[PDB]
Amino acid sequence: IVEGSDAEIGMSPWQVMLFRKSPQELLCGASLISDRWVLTAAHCLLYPPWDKNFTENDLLVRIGKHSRTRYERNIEKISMLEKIYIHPRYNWRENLDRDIALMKLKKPVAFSDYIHPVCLPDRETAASLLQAGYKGRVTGWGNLKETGQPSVLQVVNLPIVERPVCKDSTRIRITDNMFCAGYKPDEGKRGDACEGDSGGPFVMKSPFNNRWYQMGIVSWGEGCDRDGKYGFYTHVFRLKKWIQKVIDQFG
């Protein structure tokens, strides 16, 4: 996260760290959506241009974390993966269209003050909140700058950007399965996700029921926090039918 701040304790209890077993290292962010399911970006698990193709046994998920590097004894919980599900039409060849994946845990994680699931949006909540100018919140342990790494979880609030502005900021083909967020050059404020924040949640707090909803997944960006560029996020609601199908079919 570039130009963010340290998270408060328990501020993002759905935050998940995807952790490589060997060598031991941060791979990505992710989010907890129930006691057995974790949501992330497909490119965290599968990206052939970078020779990335992880299997279940390559990875762990670490839940309830604040510190990036410390083993947070008595606070974080570490889970093994039963199965990875990547969207069948995830487009790694071109533009990361449908950049979404689910991971089923081997056993349920116990909820605590530091571990708690985020909501997924219904159609109405999505329609109400996914509007240009409305701000969401992005969290992660990724790079603090494009070209280093934070001691603890970072947070930044960013406004959703009008689709034509998103489109006009890049040569990459944008789709309805993406939205973009960030400040314009003239707005003064700044901030963005960066390498290592991939897979983490873009959340909004509904003013109707005061619950946090995950509207986006950190997906892609050209550089980090560049003037005139924006961060791109997987549109969670647009892909929720797939999410529900996987969970319904596989538990």
């Binding site: 952790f19 077993k21 060598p23 031991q24 290292e25 941060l26 762990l60 590097t69 410390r70 083993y71 570490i78 093994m80």
Partner: peptide, 12 residues
């Protein structure tokens, strides 16, 4: 690299 070792149980 700069990560504290995690308990061996999780790496089994």
């Amino acid at each position: 690299g700069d990560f504290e070792e995690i308990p061996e149980e999780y790496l089994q």
